[PDB]
């Protein structure tokens, strides 16, 4: 059902510290190799006054290299699809909430993404654009109340040297009942490959792989 090469089509609509925006995206990836690239274009609210880095993990857990000994909730969830709900709590009280509804027609995945953020200090690294990139991370996947969840301790590298912390809590929900996996981990590496001066056009890439915790 999930093809070796899958195209991506998306629209993100939201607001950060009251600044409304719309970003549409087109891309391609290799679900089985857990790699993807998106070409993102700002359609409304240009120029964005907050760091682009906060948005990137909202722009598909179907793009993960899953070992055969771990059930793949995301690929199994199709053709029907799945949705996700996420809260992103920053160390300085900035907070974002995002939802994504993921569908698929032929060889293309479609996402309708809603993204809202608030309480970012005007002099913080988000609003002042002091974020360089996200550190690679490990998402701990687990089941609660018969539903797939993912927690991740995220960190944005800052100009100057330090880290700026964010806690991600995602809830994943397939459109049909599908085999739920046992607790595992997804390693991630998200990077902006290129961008124009005000991030009106962004080339975004993610490489991710599933595995069990390497503790016996």
Author numbering: 3 to 61, 65 to 221
From the paper:
eCGP123 is a bright green FP engineered for extreme stability, and was developed using a two-step process. Phanta was isolated by expression screening of a library targeting amino acid positions 62/63/65/69 and 191/192/193 in the bright green fluorescent protein eCGP123. Phanta contains the substitutions Gln62Met, Thr69Val and His193Gln. The protomers in each protein are typical of the GFP-superfamily and consist of an 11-stranded β-barrel (or β-can) with two small helices forming interconnecting loops protecting the chromophore from bulk solvent.
In contrast, eCGP123T69V underwent very efficient reversible photoswitching (~ 92% photoswitching depth) and had ~ 10 fold increased OFF rate. The chromophores in eCGP123H193Q and eCGP123T69V are essentially coplanar with the 4-hydroxybenzyl ring twisted out of plane relative to the imidazolinone ring by only 4.6° and 1.8°, respectively averaged across all four protomers. In eCGP123T69V the imidazole ring of His193 stacks against the 4-hydroxybenzyl ring forming a π-π interaction. Presumably the histidine is charged as it interacts with side chains of the conserved Glu148 and Glu215. In eCGP123T69V and eCGP123 the side chains of His193, Glu215, Glu148, Arg66 and a water (H2O91) form a planar network of hydrogen bonds and salt bridges beneath the chromophore. Although the Thr69Val substitution results in reorientation of the Arg66 side chain in eCGP123T69V, the water (H2O91) changes position maintaining the network of interactions beneath the chromophore observed in eCGP123. The aliphatic side-chain of the valine substitution in eCGP123T69V can no longer hydrogen-bond with the Nε of Arg66 allowing the NNH1/NH2 of Arg66 to extend towards the imidazolinone O2 forming a direct hydrogen bond and a water (H2O144) mediated hydrogen-bond. Closer interaction of the Arg66 side chains with the imidazolinone ring would increase charge stabilisation on the ring. By comparison, eCGP123 contained a single species decaying with a fluorescence lifetime of 2.3 ns whilst eCGP123T69V contained a major and minor species with a fluorescence lifetime of 1.33 ns and 2.62 ns, respectively. It is possible that the chromophore environment of eCGP123T69V can exist in two emissive conformations although the structural data appears to show evidence of single conformation.
